[PDB]
């Protein structure tokens, strides 16, 4: 349901994305919807990712603020939002199976 919709949205948006805006690479493990949400929350002025952020906020209802981290521990590799969505898309389709 919401998980298919989240995958649908990520494919829907990868058909550039947040041009000039880099996000942190996410360690995709134990239902890390919070880690994905923490990585994207630092993107400013991008209408294209709003739905994904709201959808992710549905799965992770905890307080998540821009700049402040709790879920994220692996802060080293910085990527394009397109690359991040493609990395999130690989993990999300693995959980769906």
């Amino acid at each position, epitope marked *: 349901t919401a998980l298919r919709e989240l995958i649908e949205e990520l494919v829907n948006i990868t058909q550039p994305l*947040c041009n000039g805006s880099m996000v942190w690479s996410i360690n995709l493990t134990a239902g890390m919807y919070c880690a994905a949400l923490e990585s994207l929350i630092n993107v*400013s*002025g*991008c*209408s294209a990712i*709003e739905k994904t*952020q709201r959808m992710l906020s549905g799965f992770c*209802p905890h*307080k998540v*603020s821009a700049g402040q981290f709790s879920s994220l521990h692996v802060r080293d590799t910085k990527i394009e939002v397109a690359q991040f969505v493609k990395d999130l898309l690989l993990h999300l389709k693995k959980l769906f199976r």
Partner: antibody
Amino acid sequence: QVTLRESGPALVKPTQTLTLTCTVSGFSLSAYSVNWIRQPPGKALEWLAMIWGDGKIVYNSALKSRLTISKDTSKNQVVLTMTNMDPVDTATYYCAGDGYYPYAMDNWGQGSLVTVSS
Amino acid sequence: DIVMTQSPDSLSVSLGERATINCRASKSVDSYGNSFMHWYQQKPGQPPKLLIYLASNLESGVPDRFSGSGSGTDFTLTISSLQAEDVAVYYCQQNNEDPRTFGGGTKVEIKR
């Protein structure tokens, strides 16, 4: 250190077009969303339009046919035009930037009062 | 087109007393269990200032006496101990659905 500053005429003749400019400093318009809001003296705030950093344009529904929002990333300015100005459009016009997700309007300009009169 | 309606239109409370403001949306401002509604304070001759976002989160630097609550259609802004500097007009606003809309405002005054 993000700042927004509105500029435009203090006075517009009835039926004429108002052109307002919002100059943004400290944030690139390629990743910064700018809103226009107005406030008639002693009345409620009225949201008018916005242009996201990635280009999405949204307008107030009742004033849609009269409004055009645009931007020039080079001069780092957002322009609002409103046609067929009437004395009822006399108001302080504010531009305001969105914060991060959930995208509330966290950064406001001082506002520019526009009077519509002959 | 989500219409935001505030009640009461104005209110007068003693210094150090609890103050409560209400806001009602015409449609739900919820998306995936979160409320896309925000509260602003506007002091005379100044632009509005964000106080609360996502219905209950305090904007950084805003005094802790302010709080927000509610879900779906009904929202509340609360000042635990009204201060002389809290005199202003308070506005609610939604961004759940385009276009963004503001409430009509509520003027808060001190009873002295």
